[PDB]
Amino acid sequence: XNXXX
């Protein structure tokens, strides 16, 4: 997933 951790 391309979500900022």
Added chain:
Amino acid sequence: KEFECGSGECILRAYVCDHDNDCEDNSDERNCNYDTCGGHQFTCSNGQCINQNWVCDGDDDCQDSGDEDGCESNQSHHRCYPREWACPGSGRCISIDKVCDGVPDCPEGDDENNVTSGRTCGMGVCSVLNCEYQCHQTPFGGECFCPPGHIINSNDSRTCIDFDDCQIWGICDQKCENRQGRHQCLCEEGYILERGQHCKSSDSFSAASVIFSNGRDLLVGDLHGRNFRILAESKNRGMVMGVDFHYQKHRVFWTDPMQEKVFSTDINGLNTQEILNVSVDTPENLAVDWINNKLYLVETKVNRIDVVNLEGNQRVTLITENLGHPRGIALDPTVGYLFFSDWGSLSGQPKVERAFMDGSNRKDLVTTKVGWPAGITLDLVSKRVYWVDSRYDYIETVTYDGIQRKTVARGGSLVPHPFGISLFEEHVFFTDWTKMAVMKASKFTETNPQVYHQSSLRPHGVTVYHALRQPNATNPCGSNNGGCAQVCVLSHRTDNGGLGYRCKCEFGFELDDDEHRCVAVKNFLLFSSKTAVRGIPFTLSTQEDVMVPVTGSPSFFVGIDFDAQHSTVFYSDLSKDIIYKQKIDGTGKEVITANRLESVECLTFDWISRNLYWTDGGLKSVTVLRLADKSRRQIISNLNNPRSIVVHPTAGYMFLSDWFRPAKIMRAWSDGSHLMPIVNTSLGWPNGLAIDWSASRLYWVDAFFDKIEHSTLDGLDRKRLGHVDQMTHPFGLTVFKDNVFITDWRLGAIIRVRKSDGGDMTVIRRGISSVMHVKAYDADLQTGSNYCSQTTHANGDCSHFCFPVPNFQRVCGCPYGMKLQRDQMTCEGDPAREPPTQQCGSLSFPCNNGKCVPSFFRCDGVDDCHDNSDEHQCGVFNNTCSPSAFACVRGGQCIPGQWHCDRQNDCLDGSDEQNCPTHATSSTCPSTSFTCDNHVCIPKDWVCDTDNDCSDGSDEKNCQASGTCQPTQFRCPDHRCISPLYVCDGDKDCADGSDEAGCVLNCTSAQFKCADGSSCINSRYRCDGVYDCRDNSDEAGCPTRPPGMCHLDEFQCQGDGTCIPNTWECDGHPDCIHGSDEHTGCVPKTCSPTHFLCDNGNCIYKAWICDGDNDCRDMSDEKDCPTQPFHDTGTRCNQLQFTCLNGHCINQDWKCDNDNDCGDGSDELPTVCAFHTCRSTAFTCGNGRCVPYHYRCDYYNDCGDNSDEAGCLFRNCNSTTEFTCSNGRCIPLSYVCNGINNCHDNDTSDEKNCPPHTCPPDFTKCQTTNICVPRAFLCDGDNDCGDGSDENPIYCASHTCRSNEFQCLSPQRCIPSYWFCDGEADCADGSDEPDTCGHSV
């Protein structure tokens, strides 16, 4: 040609005169240049110089084995030593005074009687040996023993030959000579010889003391511990970490990792002051250059080694490359080396490293069997380094060149966990974290270390405070700062041609080609990560930073940008939801805004208008802010998952990326209007955008197809770059010169490729943790001026912010709650449409800083507002402490609950450490877990592993060398017991690797085998595009897409040939470049009557239309909301043309601008211009007209009211050589009355035609000035003379020209008769050439 020897032989010049005999005549070896080696070289016995890296590598380069002497850690003796006996089992040597004395004096105990061998101690065959000195009893019988300087010969025990006692370890503590008495000791100056072996400090120096950290406080005592004095006590839960001093100035320095500060103080405890508190976060250790007045500092939040002066002003980073985990540091300024330790690098190798005192010529001083090397101390008189190890648990010493490794202590019962160490004369004082005490140890060999001070906490670095610890030496930088411009950092005495120093520049500067004068930095690579924001030189040949790292205690940095005109960088912090600004040097940290920030994913800076854009991924919007005065507004509001945004100031465009399933890339005017997609086909996860300023090409990065593309700013002419190796998931992107810089989350690295094709992938950084955007700092880029920042006025005459617009225009804007007035430039209040809003809701406390915190976080003892504003004046009435915190009974102070009775006096009155339960009760941890004296419990398996698990040493007490570990624990042969979870784990945990050697790998169904069996990687990393195994066994044999075709589950675009997932086929969105994936064969989508079919095909409840949010993810459900109630000739002009009363349409930009264009004045009638308002890009006069903006401040009253020259500031012309006209125009004095007007001012005093008093005919005289404009330019619409004679109230108004001229109809211009009806149209409308006039060719 070559050199011919005297014996008749040819030898090559390079091998002529190189200590090689060559020809037997030795012709090439009679001459001796053979100069002394430099700092980077090792000196062999014969004088040959070899590079430092060749030392102890396995090759006898010196031809004497001087560079391969004792690289092993003293595994065994070499024929033992004279008057000593050898134990067969482990190579330990003891003398006859212990052999057969009745006590087992070596680990095997073979030196006494044994029932398993029958050996007995007594006399024997030695009567036949007849030894040179004496006989004595051994278990084999009588054997030879010989005096000092007497060793037995080659396999001849009866014969003793003279021996060099100078080679024995510890024969003399400092120095030894063998010319007299078979040996003799001597001492360095300042020391005085005592007995015949020991050198002690002379009493001519004041005193000697040891300084060490108790783990909380800074202690000091004498060399025997009779009395101890607390020097400086730690405040605010501080922790003294690493200590060093400066005997000349009587100052003691110590670091603080808990307080993230570095202090210094006098030896008396006076004048305790902070040396550094910026960018220093975990200063593990410290060191002082006592002759150059420097302070070398270790940092571990951003692993680096710094140097700063004793007062803490001039700062510069020295070592950054591959520095891993720096722990220890030591230096010898007199000779000029820097020694530092490293217990793990970016490469897995741990090492003890040597370097010059300016970071040059790094060398692996000790590499084999180093484990976890810790602080380092130096023997300044014998030229040896001492380091301690926490993994293999030993104290070892090597020389300055790494040769002659000798072990002074070893074992889990001797030094279970050393941290720090220091030498004074003959004793190494070393901290140990397991016995929890500073221990005093002999520096040659020890059977058992003595306890010097037993602590209740883990102690830390130790130093010995004495003058002889800092020998005198000259200062190379003392000769007027060494000539360096900013900073002089000492180096090796042979470096810089013997000058002994190298010039440096503080942060924000770089050295010119002279290496003496600093110049302001122009370019460097700026990148962000979870832990820090860093700036790196582009040239990979060097590694050290140019800007101070930006770091905090909680830290997650994402977005960054820079302001070159102020040497300022911006950044965001998702752990604080704030946007900061900070200088390159690190000073002047300020916040920009901390209000209503929700996951700001990126930033960009409009360097000409000074506007800051950021993207709120939580608010789902983009915001602009003017830095001159805080003024913010949401310009785009209804996005789905916006990401990196980039703005083009000169072109007036901004670009933003969205990666919700219908992914796209948008473009808009800088105003935040005309939003439209430019790339919406064949996209997935478009993370990073970048702009090529040298070509106006937009570069963007995709992460779903693993591609990087580029196109013009219009989105046309789209091109892809080639395959980039090991790129699986790119986030950041930056284009600078001919390189493209990218950051991949899967790699956790910064890679560089060529900007025109796939390029030579070059890794810039590795192991950079969670990595975020990159940015190219460049001061040349931030150059230019639109009409928003043109001179002669400011900010484009707009209140608040003005936005550059494409085609060289500007549009004025104002913040939230403001509306543009009728003039379209200045803004008035608009509370009717946008009412004022609070900083926080009713359930949250607004801090003094713009942030917002929960209302029950007030006075909880923890700074949540990042301004302490929530913890201010707490404890008083109407300001009670939170229920979670603990309140001190007096003085009004609230402290966190976890600080209540934790053995630290936190409350100012000590209320937090008073009357709390001592009842450990009969409470017991499970029978599996061992119980410490602190009632903390750990498993039985953890006992006696030399690790202080209990935090009080209870699990390591009464540990003995009996070698009788528990059945579960594995036993290293002579090191320690160890847990099974460390046996065969890929890591050598024992000293000799006995726990890892001989085992095999073994893997579950969720793991994969490398082909060579070197590692057992997770199955997730199989076939991922990243080479994980060293032998590349994971990515080999992966499914290959058939040539031309695509995989089974992947649609193919017929017009392009690329592949997209079948889930994207017939979804309602054309992903293929020609829309081939939404062909007419797609089944149409249906929706239920109870739902609403959104424009993207979604079905949503019809109740939810206009409910407050776009549930469709498209504007469909919220776009259509009228639901809200109260609670003549036939021909015609075009769409964009104004219509006059008499026709002749005129373009709408000519409407109401003081130019009559309709003839009748319809385009300028007062009725027409009464309601007309200026376009947003045009300047509005005070009269109400709409002139183009480029007419503003151009010396010319084109507005009529002079409203557009009102307030213009004009540069003062040099009146000594130029002429300042009445309108403000600057013209040279030489151009005054030069022949034609140049000022064109209202005065028209420029062109008076001063010299001549008249002009001849043809070039006819003008009226009030004698300019020679011909009559052919009469009544032509412009004043050619500038003095009326062409407009001529006399001619062209009385009668039609002279007899030889004709007056045109449009313009009303008299033209020569040979122009009139000559066959060529000379009037504007051709009134001189009608069919009526006739005439012929």
